[PDB]
Design a protein around this nucleic acid. Sequence first.
RNA 1: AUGCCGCGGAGCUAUCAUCUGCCGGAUAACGGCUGAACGCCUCUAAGCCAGAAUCCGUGCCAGAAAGCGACGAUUUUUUGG
Length: 168
Amino acid sequence: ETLTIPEGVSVDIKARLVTVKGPRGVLKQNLRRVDIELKKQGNTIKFIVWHGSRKHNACIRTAYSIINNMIIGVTQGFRYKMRLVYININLTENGTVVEIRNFLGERITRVIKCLPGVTVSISSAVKDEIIIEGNSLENVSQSAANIKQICNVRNKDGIYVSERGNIE
RNA sequence: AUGCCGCGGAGCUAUCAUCUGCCGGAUAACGGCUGAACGCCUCUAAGCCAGAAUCCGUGCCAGAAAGCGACGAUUUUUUGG
């Protein structure tokens, strides 16, 4: 199990920290999670476990997934498409904030502050579709999770989500 | 031993009269995200949000009489400093 390094992505290990770089920016999140020594040769990251336990076997795979998620997000998008199935649904807000309106006839207007690095384009190319863009899958999906979690039906049909993808 | 009666200012008093009585964080159950384990899946193992009249705070009351700070003047030509 060895994970390589792209042409231009500069991963640096500073006390279980990762600070990959790219044209999309710097994707750095704290990684105080893995108790496994990390070997970096400058082009490929190697994970070696010396007489580890079952938790070590979980740590190596989780670390590989996290670094794989970051290596996907160095310069590629994590666009998350939604679906507005329904009294109609309208979303009018600027910046990195998303507000709901006419949610099943409720007069209230739910307000959600998107996580940093998440861009909303309020696309009108396709019907009842809103996409969430970013480089960090964790932040993008957490923002999408918060958007859908606040859109819940109590004592009712319903509202569902759409697929994922990559942009740029 | 306030003789009795009507009204009676002031005071007191009446849910018999009038005025006033907020929002921040952390959570429980629970719901999600990135995600392994157990080559997949799954909220959980690390981590992150949301979330109760809950808990702790802001506000309100008292002020350690052995907690503290800033400021003011320092027995008058007798005397004390």
